[PDB]
Amino acid sequence: AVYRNIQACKELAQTTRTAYGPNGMNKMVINHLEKLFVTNDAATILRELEVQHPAAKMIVMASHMQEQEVGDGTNFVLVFAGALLELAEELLRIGLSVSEVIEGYEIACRKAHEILPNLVCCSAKNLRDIDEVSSLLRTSIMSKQYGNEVFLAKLIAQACVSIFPDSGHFNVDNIRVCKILGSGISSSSVLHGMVFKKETEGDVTSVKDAKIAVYENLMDAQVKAIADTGANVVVTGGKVADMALHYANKYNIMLVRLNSKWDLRRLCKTVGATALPRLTPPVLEEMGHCDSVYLSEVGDTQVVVFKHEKEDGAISTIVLRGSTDNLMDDIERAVDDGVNTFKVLTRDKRLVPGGGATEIELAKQITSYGETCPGLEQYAIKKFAEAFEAIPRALAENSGVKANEVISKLYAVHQEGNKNVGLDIEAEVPAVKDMLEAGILDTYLGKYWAIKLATNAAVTVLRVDQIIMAKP
Amino acid sequence: RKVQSGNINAAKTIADIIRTCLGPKSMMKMLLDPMGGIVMTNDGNAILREIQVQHPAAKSMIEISRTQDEEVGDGTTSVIILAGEMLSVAEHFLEQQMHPTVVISAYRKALDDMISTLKKISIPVDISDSDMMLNIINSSITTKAISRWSSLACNIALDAVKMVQFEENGRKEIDIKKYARVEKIPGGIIEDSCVLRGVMINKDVTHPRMRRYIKNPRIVLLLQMEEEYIQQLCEDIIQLKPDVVITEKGISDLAQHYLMRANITAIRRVRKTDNNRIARACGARIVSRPEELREDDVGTGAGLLEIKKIGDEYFTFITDCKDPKACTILLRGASKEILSEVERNLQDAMQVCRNVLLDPQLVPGGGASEMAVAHALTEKSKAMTGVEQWPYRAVAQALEVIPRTLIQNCGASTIRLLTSLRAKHTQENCETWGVNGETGTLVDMKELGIWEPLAVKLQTYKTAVETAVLLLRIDDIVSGH
Amino acid sequence: QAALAVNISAARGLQDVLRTNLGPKGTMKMLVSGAGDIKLTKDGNVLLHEMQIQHPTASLIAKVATAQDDITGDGTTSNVLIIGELLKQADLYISEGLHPRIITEGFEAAKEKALQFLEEVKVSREMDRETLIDVARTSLRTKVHAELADVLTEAVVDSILAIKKQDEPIDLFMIEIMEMKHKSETDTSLIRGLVLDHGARHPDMKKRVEDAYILTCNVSLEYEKTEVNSGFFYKSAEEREKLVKAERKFIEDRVKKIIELKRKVCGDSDKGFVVINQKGIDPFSLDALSKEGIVALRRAKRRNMERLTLACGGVALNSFDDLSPDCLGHAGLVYEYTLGEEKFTFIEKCNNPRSVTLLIKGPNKHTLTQIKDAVRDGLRAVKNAIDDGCVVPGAGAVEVAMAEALIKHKPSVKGRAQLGVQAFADALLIIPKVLAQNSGFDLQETLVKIQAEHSESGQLVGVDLNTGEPMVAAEVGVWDNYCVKKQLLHSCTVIATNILLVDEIMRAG
Ligand SMILES: Nc1ncnc2c1ncn2[C@@H]1O[C@H](COP(=O)(O)OP(=O)(O)O)[C@@H](O)[C@H]1O
Ligand SMILES: Nc1ncnc2c1ncn2[C@@H]1O[C@H](COP(=O)(O)OP(=O)(O)O)[C@@H](O)[C@H]1O
Numbered sequence A: 001a002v003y004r005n006i007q008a009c010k011e012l013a014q015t016t017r018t019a020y021g022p023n024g025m026n027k028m029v030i031n032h033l034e035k036l037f038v039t040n041d042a043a044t045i046l047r048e049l050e051v052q053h054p055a056a057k058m059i060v061m062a063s064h065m066q067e068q069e070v071g072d073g074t075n076f077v078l079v080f081a082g083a084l085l086e087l088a089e090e091l092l093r094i095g096l097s098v099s100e101v102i103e104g105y106e107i108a109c110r111k112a113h114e115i116l117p118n119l120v121c122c123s124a125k126n127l128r129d130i131d132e133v134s135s136l137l138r139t140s141i142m143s144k145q146y147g148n149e150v151f152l153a154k155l156i157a158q159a160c161v162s163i164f165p166d167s168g169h170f171n172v173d174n175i176r177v178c179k180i181l182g183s184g185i186s187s188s189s190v191l192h193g194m195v196f197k198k199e200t201e202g203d204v205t206s207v208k209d210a211k212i213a214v215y216e217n218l219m220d221a222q223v224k225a226i227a228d229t230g231a232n233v234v235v236t237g238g239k240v241a242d243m244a245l246h247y248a249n250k251y252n253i254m255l256v257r258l259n260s261k262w263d264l265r266r267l268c269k270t271v272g273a274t275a276l277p278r279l280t281p282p283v284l285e286e287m288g289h290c291d292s293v294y295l296s297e298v299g300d301t302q303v304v305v306f307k308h309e310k311e312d313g314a315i316s317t318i319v320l321r322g323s324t325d326n327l328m329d330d331i332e333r334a335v336d337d338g339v340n341t342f343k344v345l346t347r348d349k350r351l352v353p354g355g356g357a358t359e360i361e362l363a364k365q366i367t368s369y370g371e372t373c374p375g376l377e378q379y380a381i382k383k384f385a386e387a388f389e390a391i392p393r394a395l396a397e398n399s400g401v402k403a404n405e406v407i408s409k410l411y412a413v414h415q416e417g418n419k420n421v422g423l424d425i426e427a428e429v430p431a432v433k434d435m436l437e438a439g440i441l442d443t444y445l446g447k448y449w450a451i452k453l454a455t456n457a458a459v460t461v462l463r464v465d466q467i468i469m470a471k472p
Numbered sequence B: 001r002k003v004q005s006g007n008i009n010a011a012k013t014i015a016d017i018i019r020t021c022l023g024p025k026s027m028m029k030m031l032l033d034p035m036g037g038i039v040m041t042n043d044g045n046a047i048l049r050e051i052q053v054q055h056p057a058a059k060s061m062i063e064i065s066r067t068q069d070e071e072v073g074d075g076t077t078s079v080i081i082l083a084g085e086m087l088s089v090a091e092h093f094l095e096q097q098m099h100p101t102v103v104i105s106a107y108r109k110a111l112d113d114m115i116s117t118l119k120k121i122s123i124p125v126d127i128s129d130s131d132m133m134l135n136i137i138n139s140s141i142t143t144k145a146i147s148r149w150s151s152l153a154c155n156i157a158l159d160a161v162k163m164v165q166f167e168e169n170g171r172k173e174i175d176i177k178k179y180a181r182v183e184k185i186p187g188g189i190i191e192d193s194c195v196l197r198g199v200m201i202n203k204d205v206t207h208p209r210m211r212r213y214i215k216n217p218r219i220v221l222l223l224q225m226e227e228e229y230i231q232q233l234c235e236d237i238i239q240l241k242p243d244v245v246i247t248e249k250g251i252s253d254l255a256q257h258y259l260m261r262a263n264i265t266a267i268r269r270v271r272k273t274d275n276n277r278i279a280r281a282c283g284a285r286i287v288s289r290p291e292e293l294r295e296d297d298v299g300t301g302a303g304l305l306e307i308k309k310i311g312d313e314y315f316t317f318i319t320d321c322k323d324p325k326a327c328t329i330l331l332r333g334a335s336k337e338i339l340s341e342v343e344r345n346l347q348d349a350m351q352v353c354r355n356v357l358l359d360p361q362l363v364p365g366g367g368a369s370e371m372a373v374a375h376a377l378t379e380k381s382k383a384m385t386g387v388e389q390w391p392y393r394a395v396a397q398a399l400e401v402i403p404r405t406l407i408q409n410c411g412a413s414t415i416r417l418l419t420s421l422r423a424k425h426t427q428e429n430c431e432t433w434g435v436n437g438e439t440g441t442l443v444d445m446k447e448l449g450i451w452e453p454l455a456v457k458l459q460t461y462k463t464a465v466e467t468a469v470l471l472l473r474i475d476d477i478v479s480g481h
Numbered sequence C: 001q002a003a004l005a006v007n008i009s010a011a012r013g014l015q016d017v018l019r020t021n022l023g024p025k026g027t028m029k030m031l032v033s034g035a036g037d038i039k040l041t042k043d044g045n046v047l048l049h050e051m052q053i054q055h056p057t058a059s060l061i062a063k064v065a066t067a068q069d070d071i072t073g074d075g076t077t078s079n080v081l082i083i084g085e086l087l088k089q090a091d092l093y094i095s096e097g098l099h100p101r102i103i104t105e106g107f108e109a110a111k112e113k114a115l116q117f118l119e120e121v122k123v124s125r126e127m128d129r130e131t132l133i134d135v136a137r138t139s140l141r142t143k144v145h146a147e148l149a150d151v152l153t154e155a156v157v158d159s160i161l162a163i164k165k166q167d168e169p170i171d172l173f174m175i176e177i178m179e180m181k182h183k184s185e186t187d188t189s190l191i192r193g194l195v196l197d198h199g200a201r202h203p204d205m206k207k208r209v210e211d212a213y214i215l216t217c218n219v220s221l222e223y224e225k226t227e228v229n230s231g232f233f234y235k236s237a238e239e240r241e242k243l244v245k246a247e248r249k250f251i252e253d254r255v256k257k258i259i260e261l262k263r264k265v266c267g268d269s270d271k272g273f274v275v276i277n278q279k280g281i282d283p284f285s286l287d288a289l290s291k292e293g294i295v296a297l298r299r300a301k302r303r304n305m306e307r308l309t310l311a312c313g314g315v316a317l318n319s320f321d322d323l324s325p326d327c328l329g330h331a332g333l334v335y336e337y338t339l340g341e342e343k344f345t346f347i348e349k350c351n352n353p354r355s356v357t358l359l360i361k362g363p364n365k366h367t368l369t370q371i372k373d374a375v376r377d378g379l380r381a382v383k384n385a386i387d388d389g390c391v392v393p394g395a396g397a398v399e400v401a402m403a404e405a406l407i408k409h410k411p412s413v414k415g416r417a418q419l420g421v422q423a424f425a426d427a428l429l430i431i432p433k434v435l436a437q438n439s440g441f442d443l444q445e446t447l448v449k450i451q452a453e454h455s456e457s458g459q460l461v462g463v464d465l466n467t468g469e470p471m472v473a474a475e476v477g478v479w480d481n482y483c484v485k486k487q488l489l490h491s492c493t494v495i496a497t498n499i500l501l502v503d504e505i506m507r508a509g
């Protein structure tokens, strides 16, 4: 049952072969809750596309490992794996054993880890400059929200530069996302601290209280119990009563309404104020710690900002604007993709050119190694190089250009020693261009973990030859 | 593209039939006749000849093979396999969305490189040495009944083509149909067979009054009113006093009354090709009619005239001590089955001498010639600027099927030896490290007699690629007349 | 006869299924549970014990490998391969007209002859570090992906060597197997001490203690019932708080009793104290004991308390009113290990624990279960190697030498039973035929070279998986246990005797 598992994994490649690259197609996703969505991120397709074939579930579980130590290259796991098994049939139909292919890819997986550092063209200067981030971040945002790479490359650059001085503390949790219904990308901006969309329900515009609480004459004494405990900021989960709204304004207690539960639990882990279920009990232990709680009006919309003036501050929140909730979700993923791009660059910085440049340069070397390396494993090392070529083919098809002219021209420039050459991103131009001058640079550490996972997944599939049901 | 793909499966299935019918360990096949009978042959030439096929693309494979049988009596099995394997790479036709013209230019470009690569591993031959030619012709004598008289078949096959070759004209043309007429004579055994150094006519003896044995013959090539011309056309021939009257058309019954009166041999139904060999043998001349004969139409220089009944059958021996651009084989045998074995097996060996004498160049067979070629095109593809390099590499991977079948028919591990066979051509010289057809392991061809001529492989790869070009140039089937 | 043909072909199909997972170079099988669990493994016991088969005849063969795994711990895949080939060759004679009763008599003679052949070729090599590594290489190579061989080999060897002294027999309960996530697979190593799931969680605790006296307790330090003749009676929420002041006197006063023991037994600097109470602990008791350099642990397993008694030496206590210095232990480095998310307690460098910990690390759940069985299957392979002082060569080298002894053997009981020995000869040679295919080489060409190897000496010849030539299993470090092959030939003959003697198959409900 090997040919059936391979053919089943090729069914999954076509669901993400076209969604890859800047000219990639979108996919008409329909949620399980009877909702319509349109996107091109491969991570979101598999979350809704229930992959029931067990043979391809290993590839999806490999993409789950793509979350740890990296936040990019998911399409590499889906395309590179599908091309290895697709060409694996050409070896098995000749008569080659499945075991010699398994040990052949482990040889090429190590060989590529030794050739990849030689192709590192440049590295991040780590000067914490906005022009440094936005210039290098031009690669990761595109193919996720294409055309709007100008504003996004500069916004996230402002959020990451604020955290690098706090060395050893940069993570994706520091840069949160907060989107508001608005006109479009022109009104989007970046602010410090925690920023939410719901404005202050009460009359307080600014209060420097420390304790924050999260949840006719009787209710007037209960709101006073929040003040008796030394807290002038009350956060109600659901709706607030009309009588309780005014009682908070008498003692200058800032009323805040947070309907989304993600807004409530976000405060539990930052200032320490946890949500109590009872109707405002006088519990001081479960209250938080904040330096200043004030109201800000940015983008013609009032927003509650929790700025930690006394502390150093490491909590960033990008204020996004967009008229469509479906479109703002596509921007939500590109923001998380850009934040995770530099989260890997906190380690040793190494950058490789994208756009199929390294994939031909890496295949040109392994192919030459397979010609001079005798043994029964060379057939698998050769196709491991030709499997890299499918990633240029993914971009050539999405760009509307014949992939045959792409692989010929990428091989010709590298044959003459012209490295750092990738695909020209244009439909009317089947030629190529230099990736170094264009500013297209991927992450070295992402490819090291991506080629490692895609080979282990393809080996994990080839090791299986039959599926048998069971019962505990 | 449905018509482009139809010619793939139409030829891929035909190659599957004769895929295991290659080499000295060729596998037999079972053909069910409509009358319940079974033929258990193994030659791919006769197998596909009787199998009726429905697709037109597969029918062209049969018309191509028959023309190959006239040029060279062997190697036609690989002609269809390479043309079928070259077209079996559907990744570059449809999946890559390439045009057929893209791949045709790639194969035509690879054709000129394969021709030069086979000449690099060539080797000259000293045709003067009969022992060096014995190693070449023995490739066909092995696994035959003629192995008991291999030295006799070598003398019959090698010396016969030397008589047909005329090296004074420059072109050195060799024709087996006109100048190498093979005939049988009853009686005797395979040992009694020899090559007649002249012409032999298969005309039976009708009248008893005919010159039986003459050491210096004389050959003449060419109621009331009815017998007027008959007696006069016959009386003009005896002016020269001949001993055998050789006529082109048939002779009447009354004209033979004067041929038996003269007690001379009467021969008729002789082709125009047959009389020229005689005119060049005994120096005679072909006259249009019997009435305008001259002195030059004589048999001066002839060996002898013998119409003896050998094996209960007359045979007119008009041989001489010269080689007038022609020859005649005398096959002797006790039965027709034994005669049928030597007659057909010598035609396989006689055609090998035709390829060496026209161009004394050999190639290392037994899977050695393919790997020597496929290794040259693979390295050349890495430096070939253009999209044609991808189908250029498919030819390097497709020609490996010839040694794949020889090792698979033997039953050994084809995947283990073929992968290591690449290393022998990668490091060491490509002219050696072949594959043993009987044993299955690797061995050098300089020590073995698996060397094939040059003309056999040239027509193979030319026709193997030309067949794929003609089939990929098709894109639709037209019905009508 | 038809009652056998349904059982004969039932094993032949079962032979073609499990033959592709013998050895390291073979393939793996998937287990689809239907609920969401997926598993990969080559061990035939899991492919038969947890798997559901369609045929009832093949279901009986599953119970054989279940008991086979309980005795020897390995070799269950080849047990079914010989069984499937025994009935295959028996069917060749049954077609001629031989009753199955005589064929069982032939297996009985060859089984006793082959068992005598093991006594001649077995090697009683001294057990040490270098030899057991060669044995553990044979058991773990077929349970991993050709990378965890050298990693896990040193673990299982040194694990058993740590718990074997004074000629004491081996016990599998002396090893605590733990698992850790959020890490790679090659980080599996040995832990001298015992690893606890839950540990101390307070900022005022020490990060590591070079030396601490471990006090064993079983006392409840959370809200419990009233220990005197009283109960919980209140009228409001404020009155209920007054009962908290009364009930907590049973918990709070017991925290100070530990402090009095701390200043009593080594209360000076350069010392420590670790409480390993099994019950839960209140944060007020954690803050009270954390300031005193006393590490308080809670939420431990029942078996961990048994091993904790051996690690430090302190006897298990049930009440702090019965507290005494006699139940105090002692250990070396006591610290807390940090993972990506969680943290665990480590009490390594004990005095005389007599209990080691094989700490497994892997990133995934389905991959951690594959190594879970390889540990139990690797530890038991070397367990029989030391308990059984004699070993045999691996690489299928026993099968090819056994074929030479049985062909050169005539039955001294009757003639017609000689053919049963001929079938048992070709049935044992299926193992070099299976491994030749899993390696990707020709099936018969590998069998010729190992069989053609002969000499005027004692020559052990086996199968080379990397090249396909005759391999001397003793020269390359390829060895098995003596009880494995002894239980193989002793088991496979009984099952073939029970099934072949079935004359008819009646549907009994
Ligand atoms: N501007 C671009 N030009 C060429 N290739 C790109 C571009 N942007 C992204 N890609 C490629 O598409 C694949 C997916 O990119 P990305 O969206 O950054 O990662 P993921 O799809 O895993 O989130 C990557 O291998 C990347 O090289
Ligand atoms: N003794 C031999 N050893 C190895 N290969 C051989 C031997 N004899 C023939 N072959 C191979 O068998 C192939 C077919 O030979 P032949 O039978 O003459 O042609 P066909 O199969 O077309 O009739 C040749 O290409 C040759 O390489």
Ligand SMILES: Nc1ncnc2c1ncn2[C@@H]1O[C@H](COP(=O)(O)OP(=O)(O)O)[C@@H](O)[C@H]1O
Pocket: C021, C022, C023, C024, C025, C042, C043, C044, C074, C075, C076, C077, C078, C138, C139, C140, C141, C142, C393, C394, C395, C396, C397, C435, C463, C464, C465, C480
């Ligand atoms: N690489 C190898 N080459 C030759 N024989 C091997 C190899 N690996 C294991 N074997 C043999 O295969 C048999 C079964 O090994 P193992 O996989 O541990 O048991 P099981 O197959 O029952 O799980 C052993 O008796 C051993 O001799």
